[PDB]
Design a protein around this ligand. Structure first.
Ligand SMILES: CCCCCCCC/C=C\CCCCCCCC(=O)OC[C@H](COP(=O)(O)O)OC(=O)CCCCCCC/C=C\CCCCCCCC
Ligand SMILES: *[C@@H]1O[C@H](CO)[C@@H](O[C@@H]2O[C@H](CO)[C@@H](O)[C@H](O)[C@H]2NC(C)=O)[C@H](O)[C@H]1NC(C)=O
Ligand SMILES: *[C@@H]1O[C@H](CO)[C@@H](O)[C@H](O)[C@H]1NC(C)=O
Ligand SMILES: *[C@@H]1O[C@H](CO)[C@@H](O)[C@H](O)[C@H]1NC(C)=O
Lengths: 273, 95
């Protein structure tokens, strides 16, 4: 069903410049942001505190404020030691959360990339380097693994806190997570990279949730030339997608673009070129 | 290092003389430090709003820029990006 991910982005440019910024997502909806500039974590939804009390939220945030400061210090100290072997600039990303499954099931994860590449995960009761990660990481990870209080805290957050927090968000954010917004579609054309050809573009915008169906059609016949692009975000938590069809001059006549979406309740949009 | 991809698209069907929103979606880049400008006839648009920086399953960064605009017949719009992976700023025009 839903993936919950806490994303940490830390940049170290020198001994005296670093920043750490986090965002939190529930599926494709942003629930939190934590800028380097701010002491406290910001809610980006009315329901971002889920079903936790003010006290439980405070504890949780307090723990993260201590963590953010300790993380930055420890990395700076690590660079001081590794150098010149590894040096600035340095980029570290953390992706931690859980994925919710059908009958109340839950899987947690915690992954770390260095310089844009996956290198470490927390797994079970300890951190580990993934196969092919550089060997100079073995010692710092052993050192980090000797800190048993940190290991216990992480286990508690992944095993217990994450799924508990998420059920609360799912319940509290219900009407937002289950919202239905309708696609609006339009047709245009752009030059083709092929001669004697023109590229037709069906734009579909403002829909939510993500799943959608868009095809160029000639009557009942699906046009297998239809090229769906990626899902692109609108700024208002709705989605945008286009589907293109390269056509020879004169095959243009009789083409339609058809759009299906759960919000339309069976009533497909059909535009004619 | 990863070179940014840039896609430019409107929020609503474009109608000349009618207020709309233009989006510039920048993806697939690394490191996260980046400069995004939206241009109207080659001049920087001053009020551009930025989503929070985020990243994908694959570790690469993405960020959405957007601005109010009201398209006419004669206006050109672009998104221009400066990033350490490119010697030259990359400009993508709205179609
Ligand atoms: C937003 C609400 C969501 C709540 C639900 C929670 C779901 C789980 C989400 C995140 C959990 C994972 C985040 C980790 C939390 C850390 C917990 C904690 O308290 O640790 C604090 C401790 C206490 O520090 P001290 O002062 O030394 O005692 O801090 C630390 O352990 C130090 C920080 C290290 C932890 C991360 C290390 C990353 C691992 C490898 C780094 C990569 C190496 C790059 C090498 C650098 C190049 C030279
Ligand atoms: C958090 O959950 C993991 C289970 O995924 C627990 O670690 C497992 O349990 C024991 C350690 O006593 C080992 O024999 C297993 O190998 C561990 N599993 C894996 C995949 O490594 C862990 O004990 C839990 N911690 C808490 C505090 O509940
Ligand atoms: C450290 O990095 C920042 C960010 O690039 C830069 O502005 C600053 O001048 C640098 N300082 C030193 C002493 O290298
Ligand atoms: C990020 O936050 C820390 C701790 O408050 C601060 O000291 C540091 O200057 C900040 N980094 C930047 C680049 O502003």
């Amino acid at each position: 069903n839903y993936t919950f991910r806490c994303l940490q982005m830390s940049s170290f440019a020198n001994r005296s410049w670093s920043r750490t910024d986090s965002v939190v997502w529930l599926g494709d909806l942003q629930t939190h942001r934590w800028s380097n500039d701010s002491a406290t974590i910001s809610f980006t939804k009315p329901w971002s505190q889920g079903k936790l009390s003010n006290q439980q939220w405070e504890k949780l945030q307090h723990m993260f404020q201590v963590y953010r400061v300790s993380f930055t210090r420890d990395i700076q100290e690590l660079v001081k030691m590794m150098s010149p072997k590894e040096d600035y600039p340095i980029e570290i990303q953390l992706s931690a959360g859980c994925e919710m499954y059908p009958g109340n099931a839950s899987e947690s994860f915690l992954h770390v990339a260095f310089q844009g590449k996956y290198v470490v995960r927390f797994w079970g009761t300890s951190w580990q380097t993934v196969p092919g990660a550089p060997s100079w990481l073995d010692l710092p990870i052993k050192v980090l693994n000797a800190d048993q209080g940190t290991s216990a805290t992480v286990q508690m957050l992944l095993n217990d806190t994450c799924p508990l927090f998420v059920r609360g968000l799912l319940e509290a954010g219900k009407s937002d997570l289950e919202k239905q917004e309708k696609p609006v579609a339009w047709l245009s054309s752009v030059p083709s990279s092929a001669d004697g050809h023109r590229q037709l573009v069906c734009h579909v915008s403002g829909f939510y949730p993500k799943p959608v169906w868009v095809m160029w059609m000639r009557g009942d016949q699906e046009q297998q030339g239809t090229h769906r692009g990626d899902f692109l975000p609108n700024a208002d938590e709705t989605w945008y997608l286009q589907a293109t069809l390269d056509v020879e001059a004169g095959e243009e006549a009789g083409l339609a673009c058809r759009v299906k979406h759960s919000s339309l309740g069976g009533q497909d949009i059909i535009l004619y070129w | 290092q990863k070179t940014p991809q840039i896609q430019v698209y409107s929020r609503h069907p474009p109608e000349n003389g009618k207020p709309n929103i233009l989006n510039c979606y920048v993806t697939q880049f690394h490191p996260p430090h980046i400069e995004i400008q939206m241009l109207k006839n080659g001049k920087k648009i001053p009020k551009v709003e930025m989503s929070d920086m985020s990243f994908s399953k694959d570790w690469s960064f993405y960020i959405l820029a957007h601005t109010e605009f009201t398209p006419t017949e004669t206006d050109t719009y672009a998104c221009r990006v400066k990033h350490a992976s490119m010697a030259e700023p990359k400009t993508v025009y709205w179609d």
